[PDB]
Amino acid sequence: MILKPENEKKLIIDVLKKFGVPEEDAKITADVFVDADLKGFTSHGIGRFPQYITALKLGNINPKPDIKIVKESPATAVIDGDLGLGQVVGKKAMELAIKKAKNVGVGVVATRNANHFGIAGYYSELAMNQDMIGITITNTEPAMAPFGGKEKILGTNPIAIAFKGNKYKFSLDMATASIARGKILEALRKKIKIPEGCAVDKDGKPTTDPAKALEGCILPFGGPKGYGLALAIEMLSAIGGAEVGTKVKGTANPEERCTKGDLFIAINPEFFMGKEEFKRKVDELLDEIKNSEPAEGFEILIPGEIEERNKMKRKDGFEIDKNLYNQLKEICNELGLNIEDYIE
Template identity: 55%
Template sequence: MKIKAEDEKKLVFDILTKWGLNKENATIVADATLDADLKGFTSHGLGRFPQYIRGIEHQTININADIKIEKETEAIALINGNLTFGQVSAYKAMKIAIKKAKKLGIAAVGTHNSNHFGVTGFYSDLALKESLIGITIANTEPAIAPLGGKTPVLGTNPIAISIPSEKTYIATDMATASSARGKLLEAQRKGHEISEGIGLDKNGIPTTDPTEALKGSILPFGGHKGYALAFMIEILTGPLVGAGYGTGVCGTADTSVKCTKGDLFIAIDPDKFVGKDIFEKETEKFVEEIRETTPNTVVPGDIESKKVSAHKDTGLQIDSKLHKTLTEICEKLDLNFNDYLCEK
């Protein structure tokens, strides 16, 4: 079963507006959902969408809420998401950071009291689209055990960086764990095993069973290096922005409870440094050097760019369990999920 990109966006929009979300915010959530799937991050796209519907049902996502700026300076803002959709809070936070950075050269906006926002790179890309460097980090419910331990304390804590260049899409978006939790949830849904070296069961024994790894812990990438990066992000998106941290973070996977995660969005304007044109030209020269000296290599963003092009042409795959769940969601709203599919 497949769905075309424009129909996936319409599906998400139609479901959310049926629930009562305003059109502006429904469009933001739909764009973020589609962005994840087009780039190949299916664990954070339509496959994650039913989680948000459960959040609405449990009232841990407030469809009528909007963000509140609690503190603000020329270069900084602290936002209370008021339990709105994480995508809405994150989108508006990065837009504020972009506006401030265009004036001052750099800006940072933190958020708390929000929700899971999908794929991290969607927000760093917002800055890139306006010729700014974008950086997004977030924490999540505990999934990584401290080095030498087996009890999860840190989240998979993603980081995304997007950099403007003359021609090339340059971006990285990754968890600080060996795998994002969403990929384990997706493997669990599909009945797939995970690769070795990703997870430990509750007894600290390596496992390829995603269910056991979700009960246990996910290993940090690169051993102590991934652990250290996850640790630092935990602080920058917890204590710094007034959000939960460590075992105090919940609600990013289980939407039956209030979400206590935090996020930080940074925008940097190259025009205030060496100048926009010089920066983008020199960045592109570096990309060319990489490609010339290392044939057939890729730069960060190449894989995602290819997947976006391919998925726009071929459509996006829907597995049978996701099809069943989305069908049930649509039926409750007098929508027919099959009407959105291009291949049944």
């Protein structure tokens, strides 16, 4: 059934307020949920909300955190999240990264002790919309093997990079994993194969069967190269004192304290070639790319284009499945709220 985004925002706010989350913290959280559902990253949108409820009750999410800047300098900071909503910590960190970059040209803000923050692209787009370059990375509970290995050690480790000109936007937002676990589960319901070169089974051997893949490992994307970048990311994400490797828990499991890290970077074009000079060049490059000769059955896209298109289509509502609408009804009921104020 169709769920209007504004109504998704009000649903999340009213529910989070019910657990003590201050209104401004709640509004912030919702925005990042709505962004994901609008872009089609549906697995980091509302459908993930019940998991948040589970964690709030088990007290793995602190509704009223003491967010602290434990280390600071003109160009860097470390932030302790106090087990608060990743969105709230995340926005603070990146907002502070942006502030520092405006003063001295670049800002690097690492976080520890926060929860999963949703889609990385939201944060680096905060930078883009200040006329800057935003870069965001984080790690994850183990999901992927080293290249040539069969054990789950690395996270799905996303990186997001955003910036824009006068006409074009650039918004790379990607997991270093070659496939989401959700898309494997999904493929297991719909009794089909997963793409080739996306997972290996219990044995280190390649596999297209979803059931095997689920007890095996997902592969980093671009062979040894993509593995290398996921390793780099596992590490850089954690420089504020988070865990790495197998000690990273609690990113998708509400029964565990969250131990992952996030890095937020903001580079400020005014300190280099100049803001207006940069925007002209981004435009010129992306325009060149966009107008180059297509291969056979393709239309050349800029990173981010697909997500923007999704948002347009989805601005007036998007579908959600019954089983989730049910989980919502229930949560709403517990907190003395009417599911019908939001989904109608």
